[PDB]
Amino acid sequence: MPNPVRFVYRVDLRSPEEIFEHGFSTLGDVRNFFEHILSTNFGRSYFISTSETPTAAIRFFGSWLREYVPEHPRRAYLYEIRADQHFYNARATGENLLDLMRQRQVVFDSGDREMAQMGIRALRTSFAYQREWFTDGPIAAANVRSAWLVDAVPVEPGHAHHPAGRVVETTRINEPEMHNPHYQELQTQANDQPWLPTPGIATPVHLSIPQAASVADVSEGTSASLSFACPDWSPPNPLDKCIAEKIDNYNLQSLPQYASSVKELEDTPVYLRGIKTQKTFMLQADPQNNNVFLVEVNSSFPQTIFFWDVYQRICLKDLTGAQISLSLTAFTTQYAGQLKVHLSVSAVNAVNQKWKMTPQDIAITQFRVSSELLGQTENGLFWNTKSGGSQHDLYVCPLKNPPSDLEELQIIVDECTTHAQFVTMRAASTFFVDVQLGWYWRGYYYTPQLSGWSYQMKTPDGQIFYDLKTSKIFFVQDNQNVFFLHNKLNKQTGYSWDWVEWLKHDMNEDKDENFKWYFSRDDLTIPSVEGLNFRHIRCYADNQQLKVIISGSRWGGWYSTYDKVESNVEDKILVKDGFDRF
């Protein structure tokens, strides 16, 4: 409740005159979670889609055009909607269902667990960037606070080349904001629980898993559900009103990670220009020391190719030797209103790795790059015009009253500089969640050590991750050394428990269930009385449970066990707030 989801967002072609008066209506009367996520036989869902951020709500709307003269410029409205108890998070709902399936508490009315896990994999990876909160039914006019006219426009029109024959588009949120006079300020928040169709004890959860899915291709390999891409779908060709390059249908076992438009991707260096000095720089970064810096145009090496993905991250193209991806990250300094940019492990839930790129000129060629860390405060990238040497540091500052010698840098798009697709959000290539695992005892925080013991301190950001592709948990010692959480316990161990261990391992390996883990809410109080976020953690292999020894000579020792109840042990693991939503 200190950190609720208060507003969600939705792009819809219907005008505020209609929405401000009537709210949003459902497609149909079917309350089926998987069919809604997978757009199965689209057009019957009782659920209405919204997104936790404007950027995610509007992504589909930036789909690239075919090479023809657009006779109907693309316009719609972004709505800001107060969330309440009938708004549920799609990702968290899916994780809860995975938990129930692994613990064997599901009745499959249709389909099976293998199929459901394919559905969950798609939700975790392909559709996750949507940041979807769905409503269990209609949204009243009284929830809708504001609207903005939005449009999609080509980047550098008349000049930009068309990757694979498609025209690079971006979106704009136009001022001014329009306020809904029927809006009621009720100080509510989205439901913090995973969705289930029935009340109270739902325990024997019944699931109907569909055999097929539909996916809108929204450019650069990106998948969108039809509930996002066809916001005003009508019964009969409705698909013609969808905003997307194309709609594909697949059997669930055939569902690809990327859309056909993935062929549009090109390697792009990044060029920035100082607003006053007009000096031009290339963005560069070095995974050996995680430095990010600027080199003026006029035993490691700088890397030069970046992309901006649908999680809003600006990532270096290549993985390190230990198979991790690195992203530009805005870190706090000691100075008033001056963040410094540096690399860290790409994480889908790290707000300090999220960036917006907004066109500043009507020719759509100059782009301000802003950090989501600074919230509603207008901000941009800066360099120190007085700094000397070959490489210059990169900062983020509020636009208002910037430090003395600093000037803003904006991305410039041109044949001789940044290519147009850089300033659009392409499909993501890694799906790591920062889970920051730890434990808590009597006011003190503890963190895992690679030895299997614990150290007394709070787990730092950017260290312990969960790979959504494979369900592995890993600890990044540094860019070349990554260790994975491994279960040793089985039905032949002779004992009811065994230590866990941290081992180097192939990030891509996806079969061995002793490296696979999932989170469980069970009967935990969430959040805890003191505001903490706890989960139980179990291994896919045979539901062996992760725990930590509390006291004695083996205090701080991490192990797994078949025993649900034990003494002198902690089964509540700390996990970063919001880890199950991104």
Q: What is the 3-state secondary structure (H, E, C) of 516-557?
A: EEEEECCCCCCCCCCCCCEEEEEECCCCCEEEEECCCCCCCC
159 DSSP assignment: T
CA–CA gap between residue 292 and residue 286 (Å, rounded): 7
How are beta strands 464-467 and 432-434 bridged, if at all? antiparallel
- Sign of the torsion formed by the C-alpha atoms of 175, 151, 123 and 268: negative
Among 85, 180, 176, CA closest to 133: 85
Fill in the amino acid letter for 510. Answer: D
Letter string b/e over residues 557-571, b meaning 16 or more CB atoms within 10 A of that residue's CB: bbbbbbeeeeeebbb
User: 238 with 43: CB under 8 angstroms?
Assistant: yes
CA–CA gap between residue 481 and residue 475 (Å, rounded): 9
CA–CA gap between residue 297 and residue 270 (Å, rounded): 11
Instruction: Say how many C-beta atoms besides its own lie within 10 A of residue 345's C-beta.
Output: 25
Residue 54 falls in which region: left (phi positive, over 0), alpha (psi -120 to 50) or beta: alpha
CA–CA gap between residue 317 and residue 325 (Å, rounded): 8
User: 525 with 535: CB under 8 angstroms?
Assistant: no
Cis bond leading into 527, ω under 30°? Answer: yes
CA–CA gap between residue 557 and residue 581 (Å, rounded): 29
Among 275, 469, 485, CA closest to 380: 275
294 DSSP assignment: E
User: 115 with 211: CB under 8 angstroms?
Assistant: yes
CA–CA gap between residue 530 and residue 421 (Å, rounded): 46
User: 536 with 548: CB under 8 angstroms?
Assistant: no
SS3 for 365-418, per residue? Answer: CEEEEEEHHHCCCCEEEEEECCCCCCCEECEEEECCCCCCCEEEEEEEECCCCE
Q: Burial-class residue 74 by CB neighbours within 10 Å (0-12, 13-18, 19+).
A: middle
250 DSSP assignment: E
Q: Which residues sit opposite 536 in a β-bridge?
A: 520
User: 438 with 574: CB under 8 angstroms?
Assistant: yes
CA–CA gap between residue 77 and residue 61 (Å, rounded): 11
- CA 475 to each of CA 433, 452, 482, 515: distance values in angstroms, whole numbers, following the listed order: 12, 12, 6, 13
Q: Residue 261 in 3-state DSSP?
A: helix
CA–CA gap between residue 322 and residue 504 (Å, rounded): 9
Helical H segments across 226-344, by residue range: 226-229
Q: What angle do CA 142, 144, 150 make, to 5 degrees?
A: 160
> How long, in residues, is the chain?
582
- Contacts of 489-498 with CB under 8 Å at 24 or more apart are 489/539, 489/542, 489/544, 489/559, 489/560, 489/561, 489/562, 490/541, 490/542, 490/544, 491/542, 496/561, 496/562, 496/563, 497/559, 497/560, 497/561, 497/562, 497/563, 498/559, 498/560
**Phi, psi at residue 247, to the nearest 5°?**
-115, 130
- Sign of the torsion formed by the C-alpha atoms of 457, 458, 460 and 465: positive
Q: Which helix (H) or strand (E) holds 9?
A: strand 7-12
Residues in contact with 193: Cβ distance below 8 Å, sequence separation at least 6, in sequence order: 88
- CA 230 to each of CA 50, 272, 281, 342: distance values in angstroms, whole numbers, following the listed order: 13, 36, 40, 38
Helical H segments across 174-293, by residue range: 226-229
Token readout for 394 is 């990169």
Helical H segments across 4-129, by residue range: 16-22, 33-38, 54-58, 90-102, 113-124
CA 242 to chain centre: 23
CA–CA gap between residue 217 and residue 423 (Å, rounded): 18
- CA 435 to each of CA 79, 101, 203, 456: distance values in angstroms, whole numbers, following the listed order: 31, 22, 27, 18
Q: Which residues sit opposite 208 in a β-bridge?
A: 110
CA 485 to chain centre: 23
36 DSSP assignment: H
Helical H segments across 84-197, by residue range: 90-102, 113-124
CA 569 to chain centre: 34
Which residue in this structure is represented by tokens 């078949």?
Answer: 562
Q: Which residues sit opposite 546 in a β-bridge?
A: 560
User: 290 with 344: CB under 8 angstroms?
Assistant: yes
Residue 387 falls in which region: left (phi positive, over 0), alpha (psi -120 to 50) or beta: beta
CA–CA gap between residue 434 and residue 373 (Å, rounded): 16
C-alpha neighbours within 13 Å on the C-beta side of residue 145: 12
Token readout for 338 is 């001056």
How are beta strands 558-561 and 545-549 bridged, if at all? antiparallel
Token readout for 413 is 């798009």
Residues in contact with 523: Cβ distance below 8 Å, sequence separation at least 6, in sequence order: none
Residues in contact with 180: Cβ distance below 8 Å, sequence separation at least 6, in sequence order: 16, 20, 141, 144, 145, 146, 147
First to last CA, the chain: 19
Among 19, 16, 11, CA closest to 58: 11
CA 155 to chain centre: 25
Q: Which residues sit opposite 213 in a β-bridge?
A: 250
Q: Which residues sit opposite 132 in a β-bridge?
A: 51
Letter string b/e over residues 163-179, b meaning 16 or more CB atoms within 10 A of that residue's CB: beebbbbbbbeeeeebe
How are beta strands 205-208 and 106-110 bridged, if at all? parallel
